[PDB]
Design a protein around this ligand. Sequence first.
Ligand SMILES: [Cl-]
Ligand SMILES: [Cl-]
Lengths: 261, 261
Amino acid sequence: GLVPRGSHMRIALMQHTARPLDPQHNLDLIDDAAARASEQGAQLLLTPELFGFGYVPSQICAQVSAEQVDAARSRLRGIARDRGIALVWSLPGPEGPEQRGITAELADEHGEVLASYQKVQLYGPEEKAAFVPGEQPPPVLSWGGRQLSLLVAYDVEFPEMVRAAAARGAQLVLVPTALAGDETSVPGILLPARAVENGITLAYANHCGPEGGLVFDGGSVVVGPAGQPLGELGVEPGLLVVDLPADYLQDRRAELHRNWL
Amino acid sequence: GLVPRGSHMRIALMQHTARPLDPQHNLDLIDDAAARASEQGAQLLLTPELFGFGYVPSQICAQVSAEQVDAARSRLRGIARDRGIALVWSLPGPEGPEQRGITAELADEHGEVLASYQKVQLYGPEEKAAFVPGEQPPPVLSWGGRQLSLLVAYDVEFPEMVRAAAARGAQLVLVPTALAGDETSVPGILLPARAVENGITLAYANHCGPEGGLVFDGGSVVVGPAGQPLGELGVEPGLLVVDLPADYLQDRRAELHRNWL
Ligand SMILES: [Cl-]
Ligand SMILES: [Cl-]
């Protein structure tokens, strides 16, 4: 409903089912969600991992060209601009099929790409056969009056990855994902801790339903710094819209910790 | 009841209220618990942080001598031997009042000290006024057919500390604590994640009730590798007895993580 007193940031998460290797269909879904989110006064939409081509790592490696990726990227940039909403998407990276990773990018409501990130923690042998892991820490940047960061899927299950973002100043960590197999412990146990242990908010935007041989969990959720869900979805397609309102980060003995991992 | 098929390790946690600066009283309580635990077929008893002198950091620094600490330590070693149970305790360290930290030690059922550890992550200004922080990673050792480790209180709230133990092979992490102020998120949110994110079991033995100006939470708990409580206490004194039955540790990119904390 109306924008509340004490909140100047409203975000949206898109949860849906992608069709493998059908970017027109899947990008039309992101466009629809971008329009709906903007109508509802959201200033940013987060969408799921690899949504544009579907979560089909081996098929992306075998069949999706770098020109096809760039064409998708250009369409997404255009969605951000034309729907007047900041947009986080996740595509293969821009290099050739043998050299690219899984990425997330944030465009602002003018369509400018503010940040780009390559997934550091690849999940399972199919991802590691299809993609090159990232080697750079998560980006952190000002938008909308806070410091935003990006991570992708499996990354968030590693406390080190979230801590890397929070150490750079992140307040709001945005995470495209693709989580199947009724893995309740990720949103149920790990995300709340990542929020509490850093004092941050995290947004986690999943696929749902039958896609590419898997049944995705849905369960998209925004978790606040107390570890509580600010909003959550179930297993069906939906558009989650949320208004956002111990000193672990200082106390940690990072110079010892770094020697002990 | 009877020792179950498929479990060859039964542990006990002591939850109680200590009297500040009364080691005879508090060590008599640990002796009583050691006896009871052994009667119930437990092979190890875990007891809470600083229990022997009470959780009174400033008063420990002002009033408790190194000879008084050693006298307590010797009594505890004797409890382990005479009650025929492995024992984890937590005392000030052995150095002078200005030079020592908060420690945890494991004695076996013969009274041999197998491992010693000094709290790395001190909590709050009173602890940091009264104690020197530890500089060494958590120890890990074979006992009872598994790899055990020690951490103390606030340490476990840092994912880095638990990961440091798990990286050395820990399977069972034993944590004396002193948690007051209705801090539900520690046992409710953080401990389950520490277990899941490493694939380990954690045991967390708290004070309870009025002690030294604080009201301790109780809530002692053993959490298994799925993040579920294997046993838990409420807010009253008690003796918790539990039978114990993604490849994050391999997948983590530790050589990058270490540069990003
Ligand atoms: Cl960092
Ligand atoms: Cl280590």
